[PDB]
Structures are given as structure tokens and as C-alpha cells.
């Protein structure tokens, strides 16, 4: 059964916990939404109507000890548009979790570093938004809403 | 069991909006080739609902689930709605269906 | 938790009957769209148990509870059984699961 | 933690009213000495027979009121069947009872009355038949105490 | 016809167009009489020795309560091959009108149901009978308000 | 003798010579108590686990109508080995004396019967007891008017 | 009478710690599915306590008894607390409850 | 005349080791039906909301082992009455190197969470952290929490 | 000890009234959680006596004492009666019992 | 009223005196404890939190004569860990119950032999400890604290 | 996943046949937070209250006629008093009769456990020792051990 | 057994090549900081095998296993060859061992 | 849409075989007069595929559905493929089309 209608293109997808080493976006979980025309194609959100949208995403990175000094974690929301068919970054962040260190004599030092991105944009019909990370081997989608990604038509 | 239409019996009020969700259980069927058919109570003809305007379709290929939210409900939108999808593997090609009924009750227009 | 599977560990003898009960705690899931899945110990296939014959399903919409009694138990029915339901309120659509293991000794 | 320790079959049901229902008769199975197993499903306060055969159908209801607001009150209790073969509600067992004997407590104050009604019989039922235990006055139900109102079937 | 058979059973219902009579019928919707149980002279004839469940309900209705002081009885009787005397297996008594001919209010229909049930060991050729003392107050109008039956347990 | 037959069964009847008390008897004509059901302290002891059919009827009869609104009860209780507390499985209450407490005379017998029946799961050693609150209104005269029994379905 | 919650009324001061004990009297209910519920004075919601952190649960299946110790008490922890359990024998499935109220003064 | 339920609460600076939400402060909001009950925001109407909160952690040194700074927004709903996390994040502030008998090095680590969710009438939101002893409520708008029905 | 049943042997007549008294000597047990159990002579089941009707219970929290008066005695009320209490201090929670026998003869 | 606030997972369980010839552990008795998270599943204690514990247990054996000389008395504390899923003994002791003279005639000689075990160990989340004996037919739980078993979070 | 305080639980080496040697790098054994293992001696790293315990299991396959005396002592040498003194000790005679002889079979096992709380200072060297290390049974696991823990 | 040597008792005349596998069962042991030992004709003591050389070591942290391929097989000695690893969780530090027999004849 | 071309987006490798299926939804179009067209990306010529060799066609007149399996795929066979059919009922004569794109990637 259903209740009050509600509208606007909406999306809040959560990572698949059962995906091992990859970022699969899901909507068929408790506090996730995907309605009113928003399509999730090849792990990509397709805008159903032209207007102003709010884009957000969080990624949580965890590693058990620091192997490399030159470890860089990235997270970007990209857009390939119908008018300009090249994927361009709308929101981006870079984070270095390890300042040298490289534990020689130690007992593993688990690090946690989250990254959050958000912005308002004008999108056109058929544009594909994509949230991507460079190292999907450090994703920590364990307990809950630690990794997510969504748009909402404002 | 090969497409699972979830809201089997729905009863909404005139002027509202019902969503029907269908989940693909055959991993060879495509969420790109989805079809919708409604059959109005008492008549024998399956008409194909077109994707646009009042009939909004939400698809997620990741979980292979698609839905059909219908707005502006009238009393002429009472019937059996089914979803469909086109499957294709090797040398095999087939299609799949579901099932779910809608009844819309009138508003009665209060007279002073 | 959303859906509460009660007999989490059952151990029966060949030729008997195990009952697994699930109770809904989320009022958006329907007692109408219930599903059962077993994954036999050692295999990577979660099969969907079908309702008919040896697999009996009892449903009560009032208590939002369903059960699954399995009769004529053999030694090939050793695995993990989960229950499932389809939930829907407004713009939200999801499904819910449980957990519980069965071992049959001959 | 414990385990089951008896095997048994034949569809059975003995559902009892919900005490926390106030003015309605909602059937429950998740209570101490109540049963609903071996295939019987309870949908809209209705029992759906899972297999064709001969059943024993029974139900009891307890009516209680603390005064008669009229001398013409009628209490009824019926078990009905809508079948797949004939999709019309027909009464299988029925009973009527008149609770107030020329009173409508007029010359004196209120007075608590109790009146039960019991139904039972054997019938042949088919798969998908929907049986319903029904009463016309659900505001006089006394499901406070123990097994005072109940409803059940058992496959013989 | 699609499914198997079971065991001696009977569920007979009163005839609605039989005024002042408790005529039991079996060729009527939702009524049974099969696997050897015979309905002869308003009596069920046991086809095999064993344990049976005997039950019957009667509905009494009147359209006024005089102070006649009427006692309503309902009994299931048994005449056995071993002891050829009618003995009651199940019985109940009920007084429907505890008044002194209500003067002011007219009609005021009273309804009283009575149910009997129990398990007994019966032999071949036993004839069970459901009877009422005052068939002049019987309400055999609507469905399943009067019935009588056995089932081989 | 004749047919073997099994299934734990019991149909016990009231003692007619039991003043102000409900004493259950088993060795009287068309009454049964065999195949493991034993009768302890006015209680039936279930001999094996399974599904049983439980029933009891009591007939209350009185000559007067004192104490405004008197309440007559009849309940079947179960004390199980798993949970050692007396709990009611089937119960019913009935008010026999309508508001109007007679003023003027002293003779007018009322009759009220009460019947209970249901299916329950009983285990080894469960002790069922059928009881009433007023053993001074018992009608243990006549035939099968007060009884109590179980049978394994 | 199926589960005996022993501390029926406690009055503690802000900062302290209350322990609530429940003992199973029916040998068919399992200590593997124990549940805790609080209803805060002034709310119409029975909330389910999650087993972890401030809420520690100790169970002994031999005695069919479980406990719930709550530490770091505030005045927001004043309400009626109940315990619960899942029972299953033959064809029967039921649940059990108790009762007991808590008030914390600041 | 602006409708739509809204809330933007900020921590109490003069609160001893605790995260107490305030609404009668300069740049804070709590109006159009959202109530702040037992340090929780109560959603007044069903619809789509934007939920966000930020917390700032400060410490004067890295003690023993690792500290985990967590920041989570939870929802206990009328439909499913158990506290479940909508948004969560974890951060380890200390990259080992605990002060080896030298002097301290104050670390700052903030955590931000935000997202859109469907809430029903009577749902109770709460923004919470595990170590209220590392809260830095010294300045204004360093820790805050709010919703708006979009 | 921790609980003392006072009348260890009682012998009453059909139609009488027996009182069994228990005094708590452990100051951690609560007179609020009192329990009574009967085991009829010859039976191997301890049943739980339900406080109500024929069973009247009198308790005093100050002296940690409770009693159990039984009215309308029959011959079916003859057995070993025990009292019980739920004790709980800091981290400790336990229970305590007693013992005391009743035999009832008929009036004939 | 529990006036004393206290913490650290602790347990001191005693054998069931009314349990024929079996070792069933009890906590709802006089001076015995089971609190702050320690669970008793199947005569097994479940560690509620990772840390350093002190483990101890005593068993007292009594028999009414030595008929045969084939009797070896054991008392062992075993551990099943999440990291290594095999039961290994943490503390063990063996004792010869009947030195010699195997009572030939006019036996009537109740013999008593106690065994005590104790030590400090590191336990993890979910570790299941169990105190076990070889012949639970020689258990003497007739008195008071003659058989017991416990852990304490130090 | 933190730590605690000075602790030790060392067990005899099974592959040292006929000798008592305490090891720390072995399954379910501890020696951390400052406690040192010298020449079969534990060095207390801090002044305070400690719990000292040890168990030994003696096993023999025969009973001699010398009235065997099995001893087990935990000793302490302090910086304040430079002499070996017993803190905990026990003696036990395992063989009562006059050797198996007629029925040559005496598989006997006898354990001894010691425990107590003491105030120890920095640099104190504790040692658990036995008088007859030829009957030591380190055949199974955790049957012989010795440890301290800072209370 | 915490460490599982699969290839054990064998008699391989001088000249052969086959890996001896050890599998870690304790999840606290590391695939790194590992060392290998072979006996001395099974008469005296075990030798400490050095790095590389005539000995082959295969390590994979994913499978928590290390191996020893017997290359350049001459007659060095017989006996039981053991693998070992350094394990350490929190306040605990311990090690694990193995075992497996090889017998070498000549032409 | 009268006639439904099912595989809308395809990506196969050099040396493979793609099957393109079309189902008629207009009950007036015939499976006897079916047509196939290929249009290479970057070309403005819609070419007519001939039925034979690499082009195998499967037809079912009962289901009014036909398919086109294409074998020995090269990298020059990347383009938009359409199916067609000619319908006729009364005084009516028309044709129908679909839509679906192919991309093939090379190898070394
Ligand atoms: Cl547009």
C-alpha cells in the first residue's frame, strides 16, 4: 500500500555491501530512493527532465595499515552531456591518507578517511552523472549509510 | 520467479498516483526492453501503455528492477496492469510477464 | 530487525520436519509477497524454494508473520534458509531478509 | 534456546480474538495456546482452505454488555464460505440470540450481562475456499479474559 | 469430481419447506451423507463399528413470550443392536421466556440456540436420532441454523 | 468383542449422587476412558503428544433467582509439563437471572446450558480439568446433559 | 507466568545504572531470540533496544534467564521496559512478555 | 511567509562534555512543525527531506592506540521502531606516532554527512557522535545539524 | 536458610484454612516478588499457586515477611508447599526457597 | 535496590546440585555471578569483549570405592577462537583418583580428590570457553563451593 | 584491535625433554608491558601489587621406594634484600605403597597449583622452580605454566 | 593445526622439483616474516635455511600460504623440513611451525 | 511500436556473432516480406543487407517474429541496423521499421 503521493525526480542510492571490490549502486534498500523518472543505467544516473539539481555523494575509505607513501584516494562526480559529449568533473576531492609512515615495526594501523561532495547544477535531458573513485579496493561499505550518492530536483 | 510484480491488489482514490514495481529474476532479460499493458475491467483487449507524460517509468539495471508510477488517476483507469521484458541469451530469445490489479473509487463531489 | 527469523539453528533427523518462522517488524512489507531461499552447504547457488507439495507456507496478515514447514527431510536439505518480503510506502521500494542455518543428520 | 520435538500433519487452525483490538474481532495465531500451521493461511480475517477434504469447523464468541440500550437488540454469529466453485457467500453454520428480556434497564441501573454462542459442524471444502467467522455486533465482544472467543478448523 | 474419498460421514440439514417437522435432508447444498451412513426414518444408520463424533444444533424462535413456561429440550438418542431401548447420548434443556406475558410491547421475537456434541463408540446397525420436544418453535428458515451429523473419528 | 480401535479417547459423565460437586465418572454405559487417558484428581491426563479435540458441556438448573446478577462460568484448563500453571483453553460466562428479580412468588425453574469445544496441542503429562464456579446449580440428573472429553484427531 | 520480570519498579538518580532481569518459566521459548522494548514516558512508541553499548544483555540458557544492564542513566531513560522471547514447540508459535517501570531523578 | 518544515540546530558551547542541541541561538532555526524533543528532531510531515550535520573534533595530543571518531545520523521511524543509520562516517585522527615523551600537537578533524531521504510523520532524527570529549564548540557553526523539507 | 517457612507440618480438616508464613533473612530479596508452589502428594510436578480467590497473600516490606492463607480446604489441597523470592543486589541476582507440608483429612 | 555500581565482565558459576550426574552451570544461586555481557550458551562462556581475562575453575571428585584401576581424572578449560577455529586447551590437569590397593573386600571407602586451574589469558570477541571433566559421574556438588568456574575482566 | 598493564603467562617448553624452561613466544602465552624473561626468571618492571601463580603436573610410570617428595616453589630476589626467599611453596608425596612390583604399572599424575598477591619492586626477579624436573609432563597443552599480572 | 604442511614423507632420489605447501590457519599469522628449516639427515639438528639460493619460496598473502619448491636438487641432507611464521595479535606474540619428510637416494 | 527491435545497444568483439530480433506488434505486417538495413557510422547511405552466408534469418509466422544472426564480425561492420516489414489489410499498404546500434572493437 501507499500514502501521500510526493513528486520531483529523486535519487539516493547506496553501495552494494555484497560487491567485494567494486562500487555498485542500489535502490532496493530501506533508506534509498529512486523515483519519478530517474534511471540508473550502467552505474550512472540519467536526468529525466531539464532543471536544477542537487548532487551529493559520500565515500568512506578504510585500509588496514599504510603500504605506500604515494597513496592518493580520489572521488569525483562526472557529467557527460548531450551538448558536449565529453565527461567533465562537476565535483572532485583528493585525499592522501598516509603521510609517509609505512609501518615497519608495528601491528597494522587501520585508517578511516571519508570524502563528501555536493553542489547545485543545471542539467539537460539525457545527461549521465557518475560517481567514481580511483581505488575501489579501499571502500568500506560495511555497517550502514557510509557510502551513498544521490540527486534531487530542486 | 521470472519478473515479480509486487503490488498485486491496489485501491487508490480518484486523483492520486500508484506505483507498480517489477523485479527481474531471470538475469538474461533486459531492463532496456520493458513493456507495460493494462486491461480495463470488463473489456477483452490488452492495450500497451506508452512511456511518456502521465506514465513515468523508473529503471535500475544494477538490481534489474523497473517500476511504473501512474499519476492523475481517474475511474477509467481501473484494470489489470502487467509488466513485460525481453530476454535473450545465446541462441534463445523469450519474454516474461507478471500480474497486478487496480481499482479506482470516485470522489463523489460534495453538493452544498 | 526488519523481519525476525526465529529458529536460527535447527538440527533434525532424516524423515522429520523443521519449521522456520519469520515475523515482520516493518509495516510496509506485505504478507502477500513472501519469498524463501535456501543455499545448500558448500555450493555457491542460492536457490528459490517454491511453494508446493513438500514446502508448506502458512501466512497470517494480521500478525505480519509467515512460516515455512519442510517435510520428508533428507540429507540433501542441509543449508542456510532465509525469508524475504517486498516493502513499499511512498517513493520507497525495498526488500527484507533474515537468517538461519539448518543441518540434518542421518 | 531449544528445538522442536514433535512431528504432526493435517491442516489445523485455532485462532483467538486479539484482546488489544478494542471494538473489532481480529484473529491471532501468535499467542500461547493457538494454532495456525500446515498450510492454512489467514488473509482478511478469513481462513483460506489449502487442500480439498473434510474439515471440522467450530467457533465460539462471548457477548457482554453493561446494559441494554433497546429491547430489540439481536446478536448473531455465522461461519460462511465463498467457494471457487460458487463465488457467493453462503452460511454454513449460523445462530441468533436475543439478550435483553423486556428491560432496556429502565427502572433500575445498568447490569452486566454475558451470553455465549457456539457453532460446529463437518463439511467438505475445496482448495481456495474462504471461510469467515463473523458477528454483527463487534462492540459486545469480551476478549478480555482467556479463550472466550475463538474460531478454528481441522482437516479430518 | 476430482479428488479421493475418506470415511463414513453425515451432515444432514432440516427441510425448510417442511412445516412443523424436523425432516433431515442430504441432497442439499453443503450437506453430506456418504460412505455407508444411511438416513432412513430420520435416523442415521452406522455402517461400521467404531468411534463417532455426534453433533447437532437447533435454533428456537418465537414471535412473543407468553408465560406458558415452556421448556425446550434437544436430545440425540441411540437405539443399538445390543440394547434395543432408546437412550439419550447428548441432552440440553433451556427455558426461553422468563416473563409473565409482556403486556405493553408486542411481538418481541426471542431466539435461543442449543448445541450438543460428543464422542461415543457405536456398533453396526445403531440408529442415532436428533429430536426436539417442541417442533412448533423451530426456526429452520435460514441456512445452517438446524443440523445434525456424525463423522468417523 | 469386536473392533480393536485406538486413538486416545475419553468421554466422562457426571456422578448423579455427587451433591454440590462435579465428580467425573467413566464406568457408566455409553462413556469411554481408554487407550492411555487416565483420570487423576477429577482431571484427564494426556498420555501422548498430539492434536486433540476437547469438549465439555454443563447444564445449570435453578429454582429461584436471587442475588441480582449471578454469573455462571465453565472453563477447561490445562496445566502442562512445559509450563506448570493452570491456564484456561476454553471458557464461557453466562448470566442466568435477568435484571428483574422476582418479587411475589417462589417457584419458577430456569435452565441454562453451556458448551465448549476446540482443537489444541497437548504434550505428555498435560492435565486438563473442566470446572465450574457454582457446583450448587448442577443438573447431573437425566441423561448426557453434563459431560467432558477429549479425542486425539 | 511465562517470563517473570523481577525489578517491577526502579527509581535511580542521573548517572547510575539499572539492571532488569527476566526469567523464562516456559521451556518452549528460546533464549536465542530475546527482545527488549522501552516506552518513554510521554511517547506513544514502543522502541526496541538495540543490543550493544549502553545496553548489555547477559543470557544463561541453562536457567532460561536473561538480563539487561543499562549504564550512564539520564532522565531521558524514564519509561516502561519490557522483555520478550520467541517460543516454538510442535505446530505452535507464540511470544511472551512482562512488565516493569523506570524513573530517573536528576 | 516561508512554509516547509525546517531545522538547523547548533551545539551548546557551555555544555560540559556533551552534545546538546540548541535552537534559540542567533543563526539557528526550528520551525514549521519540526520539534526538538529529547535531543532529537521530530519530523512533522511525510515527504522528502534533506538531512545534514557536521561535527568538529579537536584533541591536544594522540593518546594510546587509535581513537575512532564517528559521526552518524540515525532515524527511528513509526513504521520500524529501531534506530537505524541513514548517514555515517568514521575517521581515525591519529596516524600512530603517539607523543614519544615530547610535546603535544593539536589535531583537528571534522566530519560532514548529508543526503535526501523519505521521512514519515513522527520519525525521530538524531545526530550523534561517540566521543563528546573531543567536541570543539569553541567557535560558531563548527558543529550543527539540520533538516529541510524539499 | 535465607527463608524460613514457619508451619513445617500442618494438619487441617475439610472446610478449614491454613496459613503458611515465610520470613526473609537475606536483606537482598524482595517481598514484592513472592512465589508459591504446590506439589500434590504423589505427584512429580511443582505447580505455581496463583494469588487470587481462595489464596490470599499478606506481605510486609519492613520485616521482610509474607504469608499465604488458603481458605475452603478440600482433600485435594494436601501437598508440599514452598515459597520463593527474587533476590538481587549489585551485580548479583538469585532466588530462594523454603519448605513445609500440608495434609488435609475429610469430615465424612 | 542495587546500590553498588560496578563493571568489568565477570562470572563465577557453580554446578547444579539437583542435576543428577551432569555438570550444568548456574548463576541464579547464592554467591554466584554472571554479569556485564558474559553469556552461558551450552555450559560454555562467551567472551563479550576483547581484552585480558583471568580464568579459574575447580572440580571435586568423589566416588564410593575403587572397583577398577582404569580411571583417570581430568579437568580442562578449552577455547574456540574466531581466529583459529579449533578447540585448544588453555589449562589442563590430570590426577590419579585411586592410588592403589583397589578395594577388594569391605570397600565402603568414599574417596575425595580436588583439582584447581587458574591463569591469565588474552581473549577476543566471541571466544567460547568451556570447563570440562572426563567422568561427570564423580562430581560432588553436594556441599557448596566444591565445583565452580569463572572469568573476570582484569 | 588497546593494551592493559604489566602481564605475563609463560608455559614450559615441550621440546625441552627433561628440563623446565619458560617460553613466551608460544600459542596462548603472554609476556608484555615490561615483564622480562631472563634465565627462567621474570623481572618485575614496576613497583606495585602483583598476582603470582604457577601450576606443575608431575607424572611417573613407576613408584620407587624412597618416599618421593615433589616440591614446587615460587621465589623472589629483591633489590632491597639480595637473597632467594620462597613466597609460595607446597610439597606432596605421590606414592604411598611399596612400589608397583607385583603388578608393574603405575601411571600416576599429580598436579600442584600456587597463587597469591604480593607487593613487588622494580628489578625483582621471580622464579618458579621444582625439585625433581625429571617427572615434568609438558606432553599436552597448558599443563605446566607460570605467570604474573599487575593488579 | 595452525599450520598445515601438505607434502610430507616422500623419497625423491637426487634430482626433482616440487613445491611443499604450508597453509596458515591462524588469522593472526602473517605471510611475511616467514622462515624455513630443513633437517640434517634426520640425525642431529634442524638447519636454518637462508634466503633464496638453491631453495624456492612462493608467497601469496591473498591465500595466506607459502611454499617451497625443491630446485637444484643435489644431496644436501634428509630429514623433516619445517615451515614457520611469526604471529602477533594485540598483546600476544607467538609463532607457528610445520614438518615434512624427504629422503634422497642417488643414482 | 509496430515492430519492436529488441537488442538496442550491442558491443561484441571481432570474430563474434550478434543476433538482432524483431517482433511484429501490428497484426497486418507479414513475415514473408521482411527487410534488413545496415548503416555504417559516418556514412549517409543506408545499405540493404542480403540474405545469405554471414546473414542468417529466422522467421516464425505464428508469432510474427523474425531475427537476423550475423557471423564473422569485422571492425568495419559497426553501424546502425534496422529491420522492416510490409503491411496490408484493406486499401492499406505501408512498411514498418525499428532501431538498434552495433559497435565492434578490434584486437591487437
Ligand atoms: Cl525537458
From Swiss-Prot, chains E, F:
Residues 8-153 form the THD domain. It is found in: Secreted. Residues 1-153 are extracellular. Disulfide bonds join 65-97. This is Tumor necrosis factor, soluble form. It comes from Homo sapiens (Human).
Amino acid at each position: 500500500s501507499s500514502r501521500t503521493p510526493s513528486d520531483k525526480p529523486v535519487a539516493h542510492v547506496v553501495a552494494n555491501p555484497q560487491a567485494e571490490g567494486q562500487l555498485q549502486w542500489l535502490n532496493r534498500r530501506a533508506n534509498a530512493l529512486l523515483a519519478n523518472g530517474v534511471e540508473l543505467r550502467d552505474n550512472q544516473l540519467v536526468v529525466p527532465s531539464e532543471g536544477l539539481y542537487l548532487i551529493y555523494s559520500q565515500v568512506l575509505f578504510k585500509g588496514q595499515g599504510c603500504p605506500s607513501t604515494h597513496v592518493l584516494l580520489t572521488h569525483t562526480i562526472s557529467r557527460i552531456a548531450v551538448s558536449y559529449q565529453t565527461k567533465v568533473n562537476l565535483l572532485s576531492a583528493i585525499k592522501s591518507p598516509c603521510q609517509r609512515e609505512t609501518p615497519e615495526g608495528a601491528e597494522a594501523k587501520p585508517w578511516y578517511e571519508p570524502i563528501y561532495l555536493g553542489g547545485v547544477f543545471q542539467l539537460e535531458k539525457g545527461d549521465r552523472l557518475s560517481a567514481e573513485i580511483n581505488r575501489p579496493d579501499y571502500l568500506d561499505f560495511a555497517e550502514s549509510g557510509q557510502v551513498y550518492f544521490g540527486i534531487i530536483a530542486l | 520467479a521470472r519478473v515479480d510484480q509486487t503490488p498485486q491488489t491496489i485501491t487508490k482514490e480518484t486523483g492520486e498516483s500508484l506505483t507498480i514495481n517489477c523485479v527481474l529474476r531471470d538475469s538474461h532479460c533486459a531492463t532496456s526492453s520493458t513493456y507495460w499493458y493494462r486491461k480495463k475491467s470488463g473489456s477483452t483487449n490488452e492495450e500497451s501503455i506508452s512511456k511518456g507524460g502521465r506514465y513515468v517509468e523508473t529503471v535500475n539495471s544494477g538490481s534489474k528492477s523497473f517500476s511504473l508510477r501512474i499519476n492523475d488517476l481517474t475511474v477509467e483507469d481501473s484494470g489489470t496492469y502487467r509488466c513485460a521484458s525481453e530476454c535473450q541469451y545465446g541462441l534463445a530469445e523469450y519474454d516474461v510477464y507478471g500480474g497486478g490489479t487496480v481499482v479506482t473509487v470516485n470522489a463523489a463531489a460534495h453538493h452544498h
